[PDB]
mmCIF file of C-alpha atoms in Angstrom:
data_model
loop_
_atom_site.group_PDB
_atom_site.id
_atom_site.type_symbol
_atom_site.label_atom_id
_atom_site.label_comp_id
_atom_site.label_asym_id
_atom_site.label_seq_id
_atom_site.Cartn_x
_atom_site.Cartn_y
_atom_site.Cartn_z
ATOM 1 C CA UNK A 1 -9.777 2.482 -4.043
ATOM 2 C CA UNK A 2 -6.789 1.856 -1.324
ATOM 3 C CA UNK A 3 -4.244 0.346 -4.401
ATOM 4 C CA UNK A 4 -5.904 2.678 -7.359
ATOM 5 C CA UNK A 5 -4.937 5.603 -5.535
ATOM 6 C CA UNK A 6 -2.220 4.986 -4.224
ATOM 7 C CA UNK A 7 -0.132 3.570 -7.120
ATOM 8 C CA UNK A 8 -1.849 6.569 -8.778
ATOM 9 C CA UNK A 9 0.273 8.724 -6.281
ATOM 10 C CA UNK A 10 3.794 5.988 -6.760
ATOM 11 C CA UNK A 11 3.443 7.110 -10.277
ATOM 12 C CA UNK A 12 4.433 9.071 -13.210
ATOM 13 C CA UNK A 13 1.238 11.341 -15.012
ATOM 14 C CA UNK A 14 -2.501 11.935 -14.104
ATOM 15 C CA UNK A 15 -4.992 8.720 -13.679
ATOM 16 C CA UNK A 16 -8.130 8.083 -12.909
ATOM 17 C CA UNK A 17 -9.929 6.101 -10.415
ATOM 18 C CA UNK A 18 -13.664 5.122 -11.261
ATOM 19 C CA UNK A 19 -16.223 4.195 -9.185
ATOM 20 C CA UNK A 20 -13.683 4.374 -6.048
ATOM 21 C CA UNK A 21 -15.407 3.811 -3.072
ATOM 22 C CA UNK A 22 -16.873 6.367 -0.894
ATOM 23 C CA UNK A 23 -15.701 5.635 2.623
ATOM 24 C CA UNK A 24 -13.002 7.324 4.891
ATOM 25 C CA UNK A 25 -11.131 4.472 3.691
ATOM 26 C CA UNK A 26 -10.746 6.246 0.235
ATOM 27 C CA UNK A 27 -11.194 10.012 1.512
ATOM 28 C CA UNK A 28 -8.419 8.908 3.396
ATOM 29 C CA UNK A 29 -6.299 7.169 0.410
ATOM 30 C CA UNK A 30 -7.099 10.359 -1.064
ATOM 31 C CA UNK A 31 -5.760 12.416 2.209
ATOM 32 C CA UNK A 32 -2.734 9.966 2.608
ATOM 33 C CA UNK A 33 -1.506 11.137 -1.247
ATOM 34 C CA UNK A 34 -2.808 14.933 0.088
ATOM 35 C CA UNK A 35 -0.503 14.909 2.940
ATOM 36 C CA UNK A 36 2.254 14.057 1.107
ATOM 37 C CA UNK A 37 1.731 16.421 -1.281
ATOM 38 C CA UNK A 38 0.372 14.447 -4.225
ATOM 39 C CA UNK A 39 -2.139 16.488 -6.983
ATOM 40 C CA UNK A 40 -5.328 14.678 -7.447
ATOM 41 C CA UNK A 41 -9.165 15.901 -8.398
ATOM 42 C CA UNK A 42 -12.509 14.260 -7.161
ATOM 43 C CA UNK A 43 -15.186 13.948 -9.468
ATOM 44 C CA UNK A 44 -19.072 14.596 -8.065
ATOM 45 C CA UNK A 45 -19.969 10.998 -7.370
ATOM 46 C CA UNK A 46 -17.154 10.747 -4.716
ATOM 47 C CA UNK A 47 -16.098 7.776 -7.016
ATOM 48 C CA UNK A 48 -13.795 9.349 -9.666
ATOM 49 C CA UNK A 49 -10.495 10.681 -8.477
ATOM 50 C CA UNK A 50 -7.549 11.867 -10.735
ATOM 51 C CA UNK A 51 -4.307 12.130 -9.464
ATOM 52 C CA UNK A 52 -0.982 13.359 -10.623
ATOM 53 C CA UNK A 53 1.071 10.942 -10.553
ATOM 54 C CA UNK A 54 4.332 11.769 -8.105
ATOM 55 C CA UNK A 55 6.763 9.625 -10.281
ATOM 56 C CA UNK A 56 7.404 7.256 -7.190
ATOM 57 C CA UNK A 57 7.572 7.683 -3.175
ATOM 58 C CA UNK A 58 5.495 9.879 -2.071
ATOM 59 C CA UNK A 59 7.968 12.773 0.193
ATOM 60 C CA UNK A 60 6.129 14.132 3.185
ATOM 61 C CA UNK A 61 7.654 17.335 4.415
ATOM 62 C CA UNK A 62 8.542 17.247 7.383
ATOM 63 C CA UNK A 63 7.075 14.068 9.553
ATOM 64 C CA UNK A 64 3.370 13.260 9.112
ATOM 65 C CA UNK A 65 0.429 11.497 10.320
ATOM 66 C CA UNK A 66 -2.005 9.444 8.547
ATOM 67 C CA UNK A 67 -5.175 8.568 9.911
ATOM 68 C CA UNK A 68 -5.957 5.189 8.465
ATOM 69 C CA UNK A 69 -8.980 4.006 10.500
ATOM 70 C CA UNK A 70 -11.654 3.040 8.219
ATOM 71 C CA UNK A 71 -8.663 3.093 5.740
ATOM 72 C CA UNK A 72 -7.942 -0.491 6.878
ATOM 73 C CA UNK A 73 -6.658 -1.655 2.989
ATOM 74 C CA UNK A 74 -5.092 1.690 2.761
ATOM 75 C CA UNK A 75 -2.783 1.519 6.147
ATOM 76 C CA UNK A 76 -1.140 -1.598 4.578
ATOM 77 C CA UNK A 77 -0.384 -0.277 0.869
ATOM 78 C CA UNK A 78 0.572 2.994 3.053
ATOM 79 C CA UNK A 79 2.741 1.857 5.632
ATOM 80 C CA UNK A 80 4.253 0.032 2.664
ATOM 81 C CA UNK A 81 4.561 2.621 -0.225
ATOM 82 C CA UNK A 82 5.796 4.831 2.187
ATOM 83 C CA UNK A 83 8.724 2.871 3.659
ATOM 84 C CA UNK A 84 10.430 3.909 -0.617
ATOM 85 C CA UNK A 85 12.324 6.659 -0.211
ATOM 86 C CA UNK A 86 12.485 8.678 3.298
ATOM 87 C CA UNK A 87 9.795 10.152 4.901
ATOM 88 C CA UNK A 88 8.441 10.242 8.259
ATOM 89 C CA UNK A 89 5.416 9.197 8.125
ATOM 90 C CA UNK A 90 2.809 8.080 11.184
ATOM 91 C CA UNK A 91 0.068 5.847 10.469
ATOM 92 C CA UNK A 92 -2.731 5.851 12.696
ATOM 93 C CA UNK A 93 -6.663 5.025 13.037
ATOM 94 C CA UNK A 94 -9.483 5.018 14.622
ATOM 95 C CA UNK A 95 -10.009 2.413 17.854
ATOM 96 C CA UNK A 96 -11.160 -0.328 15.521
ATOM 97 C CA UNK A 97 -8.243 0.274 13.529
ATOM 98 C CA UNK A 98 -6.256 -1.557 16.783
ATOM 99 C CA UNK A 99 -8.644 -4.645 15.682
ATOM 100 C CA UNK A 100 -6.083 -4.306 12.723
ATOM 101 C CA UNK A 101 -2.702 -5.037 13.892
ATOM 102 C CA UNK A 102 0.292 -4.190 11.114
ATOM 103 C CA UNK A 103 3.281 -5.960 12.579
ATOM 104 C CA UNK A 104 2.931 -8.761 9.944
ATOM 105 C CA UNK A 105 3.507 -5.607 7.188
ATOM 106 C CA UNK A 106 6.087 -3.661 9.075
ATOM 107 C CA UNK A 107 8.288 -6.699 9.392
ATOM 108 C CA UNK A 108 7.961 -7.871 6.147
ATOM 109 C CA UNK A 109 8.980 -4.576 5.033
ATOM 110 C CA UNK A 110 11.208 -3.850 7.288
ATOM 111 C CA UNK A 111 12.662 -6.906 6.416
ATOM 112 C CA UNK A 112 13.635 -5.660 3.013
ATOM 113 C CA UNK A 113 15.640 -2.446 4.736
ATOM 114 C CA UNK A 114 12.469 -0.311 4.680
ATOM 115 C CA UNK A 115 12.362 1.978 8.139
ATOM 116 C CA UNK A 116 9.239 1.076 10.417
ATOM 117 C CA UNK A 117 9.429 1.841 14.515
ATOM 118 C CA UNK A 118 5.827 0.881 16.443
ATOM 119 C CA UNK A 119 4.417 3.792 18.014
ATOM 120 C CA UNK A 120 1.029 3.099 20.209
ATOM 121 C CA UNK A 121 1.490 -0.762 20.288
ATOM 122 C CA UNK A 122 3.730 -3.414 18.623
ATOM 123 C CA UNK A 123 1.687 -4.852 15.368
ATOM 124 C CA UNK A 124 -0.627 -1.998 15.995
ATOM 125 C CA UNK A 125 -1.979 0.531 13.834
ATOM 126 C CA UNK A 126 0.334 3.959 14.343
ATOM 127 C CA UNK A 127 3.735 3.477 12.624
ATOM 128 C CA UNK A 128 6.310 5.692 12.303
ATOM 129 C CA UNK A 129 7.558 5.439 8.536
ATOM 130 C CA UNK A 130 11.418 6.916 7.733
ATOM 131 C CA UNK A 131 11.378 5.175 3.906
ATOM 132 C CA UNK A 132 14.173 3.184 3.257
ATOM 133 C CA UNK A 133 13.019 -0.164 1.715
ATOM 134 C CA UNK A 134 15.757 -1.300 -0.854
ATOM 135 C CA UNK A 135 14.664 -5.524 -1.332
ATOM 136 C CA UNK A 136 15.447 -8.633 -0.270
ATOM 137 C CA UNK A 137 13.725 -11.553 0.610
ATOM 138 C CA UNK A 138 10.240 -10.700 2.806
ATOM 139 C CA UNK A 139 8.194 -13.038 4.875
ATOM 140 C CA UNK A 140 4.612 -12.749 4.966
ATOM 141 C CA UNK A 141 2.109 -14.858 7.016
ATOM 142 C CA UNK A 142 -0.360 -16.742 4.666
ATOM 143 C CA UNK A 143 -3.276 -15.847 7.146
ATOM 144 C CA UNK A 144 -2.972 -11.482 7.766
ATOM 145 C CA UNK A 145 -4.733 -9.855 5.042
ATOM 146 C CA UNK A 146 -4.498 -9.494 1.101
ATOM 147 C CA UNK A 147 -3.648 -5.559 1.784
ATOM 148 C CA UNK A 148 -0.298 -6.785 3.702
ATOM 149 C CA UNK A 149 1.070 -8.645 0.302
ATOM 150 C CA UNK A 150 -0.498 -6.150 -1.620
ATOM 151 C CA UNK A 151 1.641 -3.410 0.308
ATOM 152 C CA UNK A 152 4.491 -5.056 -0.316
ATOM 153 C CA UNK A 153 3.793 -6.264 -3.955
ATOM 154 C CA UNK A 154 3.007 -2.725 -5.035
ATOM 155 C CA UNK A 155 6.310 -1.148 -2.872
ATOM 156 C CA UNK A 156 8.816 -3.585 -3.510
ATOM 157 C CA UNK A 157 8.995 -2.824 -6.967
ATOM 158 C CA UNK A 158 9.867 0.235 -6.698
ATOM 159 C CA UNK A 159 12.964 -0.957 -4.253
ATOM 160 C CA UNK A 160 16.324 -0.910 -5.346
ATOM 161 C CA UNK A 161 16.641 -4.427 -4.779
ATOM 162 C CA UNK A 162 14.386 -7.323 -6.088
ATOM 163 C CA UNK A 163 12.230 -8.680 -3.180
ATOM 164 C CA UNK A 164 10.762 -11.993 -2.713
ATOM 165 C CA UNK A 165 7.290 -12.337 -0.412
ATOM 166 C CA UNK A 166 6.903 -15.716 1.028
ATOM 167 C CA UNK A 167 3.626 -16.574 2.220
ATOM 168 C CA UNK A 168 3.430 -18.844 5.619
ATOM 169 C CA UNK A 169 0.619 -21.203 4.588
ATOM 170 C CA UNK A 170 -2.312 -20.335 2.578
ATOM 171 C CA UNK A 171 -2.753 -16.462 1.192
ATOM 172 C CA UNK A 172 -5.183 -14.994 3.068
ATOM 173 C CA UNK A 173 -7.293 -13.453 0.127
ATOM 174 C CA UNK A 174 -5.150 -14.990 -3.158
ATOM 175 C CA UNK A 175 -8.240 -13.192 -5.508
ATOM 176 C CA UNK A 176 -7.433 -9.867 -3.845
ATOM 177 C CA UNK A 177 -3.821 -10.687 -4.640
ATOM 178 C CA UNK A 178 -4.608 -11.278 -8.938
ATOM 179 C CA UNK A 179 -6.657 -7.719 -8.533
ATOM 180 C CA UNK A 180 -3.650 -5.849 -6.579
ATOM 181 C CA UNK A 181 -0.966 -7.443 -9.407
ATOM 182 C CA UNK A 182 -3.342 -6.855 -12.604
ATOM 183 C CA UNK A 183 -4.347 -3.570 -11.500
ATOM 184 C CA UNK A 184 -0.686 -2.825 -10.633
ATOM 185 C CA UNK A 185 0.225 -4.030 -13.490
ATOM 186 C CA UNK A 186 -1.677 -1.213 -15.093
ATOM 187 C CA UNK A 187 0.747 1.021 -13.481
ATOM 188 C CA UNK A 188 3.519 -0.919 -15.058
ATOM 189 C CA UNK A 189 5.177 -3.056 -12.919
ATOM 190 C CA UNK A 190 4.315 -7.262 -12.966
ATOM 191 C CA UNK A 191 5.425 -9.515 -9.199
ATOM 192 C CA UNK A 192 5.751 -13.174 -9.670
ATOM 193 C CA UNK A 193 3.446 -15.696 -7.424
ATOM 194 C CA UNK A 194 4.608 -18.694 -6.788
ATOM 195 C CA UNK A 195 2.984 -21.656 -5.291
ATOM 196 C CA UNK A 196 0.471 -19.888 -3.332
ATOM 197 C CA UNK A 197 2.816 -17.752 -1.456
ATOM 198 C CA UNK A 198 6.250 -16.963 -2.389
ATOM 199 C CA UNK A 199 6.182 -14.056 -4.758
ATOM 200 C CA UNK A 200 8.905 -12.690 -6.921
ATOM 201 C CA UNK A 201 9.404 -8.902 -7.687
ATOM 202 C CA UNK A 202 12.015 -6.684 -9.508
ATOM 203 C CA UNK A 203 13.199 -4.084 -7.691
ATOM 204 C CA UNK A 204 14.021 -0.870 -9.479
ATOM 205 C CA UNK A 205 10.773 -0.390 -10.856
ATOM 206 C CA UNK A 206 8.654 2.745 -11.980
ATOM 207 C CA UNK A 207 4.963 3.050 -12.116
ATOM 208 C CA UNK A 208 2.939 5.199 -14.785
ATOM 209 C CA UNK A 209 -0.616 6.220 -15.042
ATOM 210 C CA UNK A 210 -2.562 4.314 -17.197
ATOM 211 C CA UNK A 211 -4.975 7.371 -17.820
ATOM 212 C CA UNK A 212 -8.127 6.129 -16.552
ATOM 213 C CA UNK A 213 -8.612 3.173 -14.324
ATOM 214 C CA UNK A 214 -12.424 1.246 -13.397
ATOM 215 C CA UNK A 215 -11.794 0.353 -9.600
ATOM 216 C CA UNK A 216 -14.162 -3.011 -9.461
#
């Protein structure tokens, strides 16, 4: 799941997520979009989930708190998605979750005007999300984690502003990348990759459900 479910939230109609993955890490993707209000159904299997899509940002009422532990591709396309619009958001995790700092993300999309303050630890897993990422130019370390670019490659469509990722060295997971941008792309929105790293996005963007979706 973690992307699937998520841009399932960011957008417009009810899709489905098959064979999702059974794991906090989902339940969680799954309780991210519940906090913030966002109508989805879970099949049997654990592995189908429907959502309705939100049409964009996901607004939390009031501030809330997201417990991303096992959700470890889920904090990043979280901590991302949810720096859109304006909502105060905290992500948090379990204590292997601080194995999994976040800095690289916040920066990178804080660096495009989205709102990110470290709670616990700087880089560290709790964030305190206020919304607010617009575009502009993003720099993300090469060696982090494919859910970082991802975060941003999914979010920064949906900013104002186009947004340009530039990877420091060699993409950390390139393959998770194509997945995150063809699967997105489902959702209607398409990021330009450059030579491994730099990637180009228009801002402004919507995403729509696809209807049903076969999470590999």
């Amino acid at each position: 799941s973690n992307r699937a479910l998520l841009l399932a939230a960011l957008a417009h109609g009810k899709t489905v997520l098959t064979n999702l993955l059974d794991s906090d890490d989902v339940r969680h993707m799954l309780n991210a979009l519940t906090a913030l209000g966002v109508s989805y159904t879970l099949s049997a299997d654990r592995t189908r989930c429907e959502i309705i899509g939100n049409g964009g940002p996901l607004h939390a009422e009031g501030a809330l708190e997201l417990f991303l532990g096992n959700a470890g591709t889920a904090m990043r396309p979280l901590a991302a998605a949810l720096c859109l619009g304006s909502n105060d958001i905290v992500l948090t995790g379990e204590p292997r979750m601080k194995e999994r700092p976040i800095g690289h993300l916040v920066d990178a999309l804080r660096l495009g005007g989205a709102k990110i303050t470290y709670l616990e630890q700087e880089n560290y897993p709790p964030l305190r999300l206020q919304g607010g990422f617009t575009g502009g130019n993003v720099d993300v370390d090469g060696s982090v984690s494919s859910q970082f670019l991802t975060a941003l490659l999914m979010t920064a469509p949906l900013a104002p502003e186009d947004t340009v990722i530039r990877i420091k060295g060699d993409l950390v997971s390139k393959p998770y990348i194509d997945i995150t941008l063809n699967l997105m792309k489902t959702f209607g929105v398409e990021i330009e990759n450059q030579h491994y790293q730099q990637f180009v996005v228009k801002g402004g963007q919507s995403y729509q459900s696809p209807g049903t979706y076969l999470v590999e």
